[PDB]
Design a protein around this ligand. Structure first.
Ligand SMILES: NC(=O)C1=CN([C@@H]2O[C@H](COP(=O)(O)OP(=O)(O)OC[C@H]3O[C@@H](n4cnc5c(N)ncnc54)[C@H](OP(=O)(O)O)[C@@H]3O)[C@@H](O)[C@H]2O)C=CC1
Ligand SMILES: NC(=O)C1=CN([C@@H]2O[C@H](COP(=O)(O)OP(=O)(O)OC[C@H]3O[C@@H](n4cnc5c(N)ncnc54)[C@H](OP(=O)(O)O)[C@@H]3O)[C@@H](O)[C@H]2O)C=CC1
Ligand SMILES: C[C@]12C[C@H](O)[C@H]3[C@@H](CCC4=CC(=O)CC[C@@]43C)[C@@H]1CC[C@@H]2C(=O)CO
Ligand SMILES: C[C@]12C[C@H](O)[C@H]3[C@@H](CCC4=CC(=O)CC[C@@]43C)[C@@H]1CC[C@@H]2C(=O)CO
Lengths: 265, 265
């Protein structure tokens, strides 16, 4: 079947890194469709600007809770507060990411440990906190990733690690949910270069490549999650999903189940 | 190019998780090849019993330094101590891992963090500590991964995560090294089920899969690192390398380079 903006109307949705990037654009879209939405980021002032434009756009609800996702406590406690305000949860969109910049890795061990904590750990934390409600509503999670999470590119080793980490963790959780017959879907969103302020300013002078619209990307992330697709590739080239779709892995993932004890499920 | 045990005579090698399993096996193989070797794990008594057999096997040299790789400080300090102990480094073999069990992910958030620290973080730490020596030696690094580091199967999400993290990071370091003309190689070893005791113990009552012999596996890991191959797949099936090999990714990666500003490296 196809997508209809009426599919998200009245649905309670959580969006991280909603302050400015494509995450912010995602809020605006959820609003125009009329959905309850609690955002989050670090900039309290910024979450404000957006939360109000959400009501305007037509959001059934719109709240914000400031904090850093570098603190696993605030992350788990964010999903709980958020859920309370909406009286349930329908969609969890893990989008935020700690700051990263193009650079040949040298020895920033602490910068790495942070990238993992914020880009990966916090996701696994909130996803856990949100699962119980997500199970109630037969919801779905959208974990935002990059092409660099399916493949390798120089100057972003730590960032890439976290995004690969994501694929490996959630891809497992996804099938682990499916074999246990729990109707909560996981959608890994594989994005190409995007119009956002952060990306453009950070690749300036280092990488010259065409970027795609911060708003269209956002609509696609939402549509795909709503349609409950496993993966969503959004990029300039129609070859990406084919070159990175890894059919071989799909085959092996399939065969491997053959050796498990069905009882254990 | 064809392998020949001579390629390791007089080579200084570090091997983690040498206390048992594939680690201990790689030690023994390095010894028969007359190489200088320093091993690590946590069990002192365990390292002792194996550091002896190594000598008896014909090792040019053999010493041990016990400690937990959960300690980022002990990790980095382990490489320096091990380097002074052998007066240089030729090959770094990152193999150790933290205790892991097959269970559907629930909410073990602290376990996840542990697995990332020991299985992934300590690796970037030791590879960063050891790089300067590896650069002088024009040596190489061997990162032991699993099929679950290229694909996904239920009941090993955190493990699978850290493994994906390794591929994302070292694949990026590898290409970064080549792009900046540094003759240090990175070999990612994609291993299938292997007959070690912790593997057979852990899959008992859950998985049917046939295992492969630890010594043949260990040898092939060495052969590949020595021949400086990017990736090495060792599995009972000849189909695995063509299924998990993911050529489309290699294609993307190549073209990806042609978008950078060549004067950055
Ligand atoms: N734009 C692109 O070209 C591409 C982006 N992506 C992915 O898309 C997603 C969004 O990226 P994008 O919108 O461009 O990035 P932005 O940097 O523009 O947005 C990041 C968001 O995360 C928030 N954030 C940053 N640090 C923290 C923190 N420590 N704790 C909590 N929130 C934080 C920021 O708010 P604040 O700083 O105010 O806290 C902002 O709201 C990411 O997951 C990224 O990997 C993938 C491919 C391409
Ligand atoms: N066997 C298999 O089927 C396969 C294994 N692999 C990979 O092969 C490698 C070896 O696995 P395998 O030999 O079977 O595993 P084992 O459990 O048999 O060996 C693990 C080694 O790591 C050491 N270790 C454990 N905990 C710590 C710690 N906290 N700090 C430092 N060292 C530690 C152990 O010694 P100690 O506890 O005394 O410190 C031991 O010598 C790993 O990278 C694994 O992921 C991949 C595919 C298949
Ligand atoms: C990682 C970033 C987003 C995204 O990941 C970018 C990367 C720059 C290189 C690059 C080229 C692509 O065609 C895929 C996206 C990507 C790999 C970007 C640099 C900083 C930026 C941010 O940190 C968030 O926007
Ligand atoms: C991860 C382990 C090794 C290896 O990774 C195993 C995994 C069990 C599932 C599995 C089946 C395979 O056909 C590929 C190897 C693998 C994915 C194993 C469980 C415990 C064991 C250890 O902890 C180290 O040996």
């Amino acid at each position: 079947e196809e997508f209809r903006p009426e599919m998200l109307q009245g649905k309670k949705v959580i969006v991280t890194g909603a302050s400015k990037g494509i995450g912010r654009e995602m809020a605006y879209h959820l609003s125009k469709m009329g959905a309850h939405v609690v955002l989050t980021a670090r900039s309290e002032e910024g979450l404000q600007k957006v939360v109000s434009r959400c009501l305007e756009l037509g959001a059934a609800s719109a709240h914000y809770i400031a904090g850093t996702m570098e603190d696993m406590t605030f992350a788990e406690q964010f999903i709980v507060k958020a859920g309370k305000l909406m009286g349930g949860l329908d969609m969890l969109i893990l989008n935020h990411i700690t700051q990263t910049s193009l650079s040949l890795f040298h020895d920033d061990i602490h910068s790495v440990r942070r990238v993992m904590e914020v880009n990966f750990l916090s996701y696994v934390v909130m996803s856990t906190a949100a699962l119980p409600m997500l199970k109630q509503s037969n919801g779905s999670i959208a974990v935002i990733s990059s092409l660099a999470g399916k493949m390798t590119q120089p100057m972003i080793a730590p960032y890439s690690a976290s995004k690969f980490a994501l694929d490996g963790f959630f891809s497992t959780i996804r099938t682990e949910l499916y074999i246990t017959k729990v109707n909560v879907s996981i959608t890994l969103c594989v994005l190409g270069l995007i119009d956002t302020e952060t990306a453009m300013k950070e690749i300036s002078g280092i990488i010259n490549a065409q970027a795609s619209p911060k708003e269209e990307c956002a609509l696609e992330i939402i549509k795909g999650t709503a349609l409950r697709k496993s993966e969503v590739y959004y990029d300039k080239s129609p070859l990406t999903p084919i070159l990175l779709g890894n059919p071989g892995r799909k085959i092996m993932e399939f065969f491997s189940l053959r050796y498990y004890n069905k009882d254990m499920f």
